[PDB]
Structures are given as structure tokens and as C-alpha cells.
Amino acid sequence: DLLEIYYDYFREQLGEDYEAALESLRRVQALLVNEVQSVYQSQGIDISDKHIEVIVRQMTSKVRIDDGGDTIMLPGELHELREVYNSNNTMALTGMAPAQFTPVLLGITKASLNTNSFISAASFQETTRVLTEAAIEGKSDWLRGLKENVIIGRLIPAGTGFK
């Protein structure tokens, strides 16, 4: 609800959705990073802040299409902020009606189940649910992650197998 409060405040104080989402997400991200670091340092443990920043950016990088415009984005869908911004830009570039959205905070399990590869998600949790959803959507997996070149048995796209 802190995210919602920040979004509501910024969508007026500023007036543009994209910047309101950016500022709200920034403030919530800073809060989350600081809280995690404080909890860790209470016991006298030190980790760099980049390690927590990567996780927080994996948790605060999505948006709910509140009400779509001429976009192919139906309401209720979770999409990356960058993709939504680019689509809205090209849509009002041609002169269409853009879409509205609300930034969201996912979590460490809800964000891992929203990946674009069903093999990674099915191998994490709720295998039957993920597999049923993938079968219904007719999804295809292009094997662009470490857990999927690991499962099939290819060179992982990281490290000495980068290219």
C-alpha cells in the first residue's frame, strides 16, 4: 500500500504516469534495500548493496495494465515497465490511445513464476499448474536461461559459455 500511496500522490503532484511509477518504485526500492541491509547488519553481517539491489529490481520491475488503450495489453496482465513504456510511446507516436497501468510489488516467489520460460517455472514450484497453463497457452521456450541450458545440457550462456 506504500507503493499505491506513492503512485497516487505522484500521479497528481507530477501528472504523468510513467514518471509517477518510476518515482514510486524508486522510493519503495530504497525502503526495501535499506530495510534488508539493516536487518543483516543488526547481527553484524556485511554484504554489498548491489547483491540486494539485483533482487529488489527483480521484485519491483512490473506493472499491472489498469486499462488498456489501443494496445494488445489486456487489463489484468503483468508486464515490464520498460515494455509498457515503449509500447505506449510507439502507440501515441502513431496517434493512438495509450494504456494505463499501476506499478506492483511482486515478491520472491510470485516474480519467479511470472518468467517467460515455462521450463524454469515448472521446475521451481507448482509443476502441474505451470504445465497446465503452458499447455493451454501453447507456450514455447527458447532456452535463454541457466536453468534451461542446464536442464537440456547445453553450455550455459554465462561465463566461458557466453558466446
Partner 1 sequence: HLPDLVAIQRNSFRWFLEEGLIEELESFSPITDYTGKLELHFLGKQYKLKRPKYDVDEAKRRDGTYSVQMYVPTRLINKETGEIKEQEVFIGDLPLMTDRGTFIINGAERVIVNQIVRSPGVYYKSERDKNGRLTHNASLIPNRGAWLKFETDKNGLVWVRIDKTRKLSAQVLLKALGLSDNEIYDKLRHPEYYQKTIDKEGQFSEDEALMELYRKLRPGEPPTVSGGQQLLESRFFDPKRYDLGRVGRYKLNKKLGLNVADTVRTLTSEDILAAIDYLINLELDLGGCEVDDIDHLGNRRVRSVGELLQNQVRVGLNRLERIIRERMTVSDSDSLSPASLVNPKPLVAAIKEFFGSSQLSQFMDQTNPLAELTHKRRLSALGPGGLTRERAGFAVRDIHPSHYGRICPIETPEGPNAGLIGSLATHARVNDYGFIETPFWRVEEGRVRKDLAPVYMTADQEDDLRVAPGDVATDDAGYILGTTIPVRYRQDFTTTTPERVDYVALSPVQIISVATSLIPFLEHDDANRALMGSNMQRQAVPLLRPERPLVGTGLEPQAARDSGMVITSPVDGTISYVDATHIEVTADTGEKYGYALQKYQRSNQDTCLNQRPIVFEGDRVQRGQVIADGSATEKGELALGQNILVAYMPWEGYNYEDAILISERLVYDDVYTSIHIEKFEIEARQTKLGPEEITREIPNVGEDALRQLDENGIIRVGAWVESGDILVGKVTPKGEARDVRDNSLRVPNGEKGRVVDVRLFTREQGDELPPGANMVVRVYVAQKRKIQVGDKMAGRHGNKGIISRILPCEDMPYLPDGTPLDIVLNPLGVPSRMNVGQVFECMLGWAGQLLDARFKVTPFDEMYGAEASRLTVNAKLSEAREQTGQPWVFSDDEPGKIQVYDGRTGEPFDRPVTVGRAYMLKLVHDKIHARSTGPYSLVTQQPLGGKAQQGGQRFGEMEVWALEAYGAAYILQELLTVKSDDMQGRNEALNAIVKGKAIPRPGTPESFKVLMRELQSLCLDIAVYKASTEDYEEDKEVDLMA
Partner 2 sequence: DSQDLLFKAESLIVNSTNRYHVTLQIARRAKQARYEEMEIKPVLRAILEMSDELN
Partner 3 sequence: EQRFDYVKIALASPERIRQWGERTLPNGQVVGEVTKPETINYRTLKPEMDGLFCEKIFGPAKDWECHCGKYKRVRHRGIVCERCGVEVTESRVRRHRMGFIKLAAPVAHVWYLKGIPSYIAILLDMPLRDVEQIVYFNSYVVLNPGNHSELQYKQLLNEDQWMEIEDQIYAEESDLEGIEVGIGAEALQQLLQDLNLNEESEKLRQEIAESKGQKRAKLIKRLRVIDNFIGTESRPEWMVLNVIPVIPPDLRPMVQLRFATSDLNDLYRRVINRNNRLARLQEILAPEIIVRNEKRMLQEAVDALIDNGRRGRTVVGANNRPLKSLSDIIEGKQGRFRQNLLGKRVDYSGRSVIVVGPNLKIHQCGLPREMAIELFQPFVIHRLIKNHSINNIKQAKKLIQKNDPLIWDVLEEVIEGHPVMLNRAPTLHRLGIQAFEPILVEGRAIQLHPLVCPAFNADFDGDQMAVHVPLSIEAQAEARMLMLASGNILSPATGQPIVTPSQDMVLGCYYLTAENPGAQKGAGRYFANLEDAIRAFEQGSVDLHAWVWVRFDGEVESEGESDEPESVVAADDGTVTKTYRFRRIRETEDGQRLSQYVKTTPGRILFNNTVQTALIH
User: Residues in the site for partner 3, rule: CB under 8 A?
Assistant: 46-48, 51, 74-76, 118-119, 122-123, 127-129, 131-143, 147, 150-151, 154, 159-160
The site string for partner 1 over 121-160 (x = CB under 8 A, - otherwise) reads ----------x---x----x-----x---xxxxxxx-xxx
**Residue 93 CB-density burial (10 A; 0-12 exposed, 13-18 middle, 19+ buried):** exposed
What span, in angstroms and rounded, lies between the C-alpha atoms of 119 and 127? 9
The site string for partner 1 over 84-123 (x = CB under 8 A, - otherwise) reads ----------------------------------------
Nearer to partner 3, 27 or 147 (CB): 147
Other Cβ atoms less than 10 A from the Cβ of 10: the count is 21
The string over 43-58, giving b where at least 16 C-beta atoms fall within 10 Å of a residue's C-beta and e elsewhere, is: eeeeeeeeebeeebee
Q: Which stretch binds partner 2 (CB under 8 A): 14-22, 53-61, 123-131, 155-163?
A: 155-163
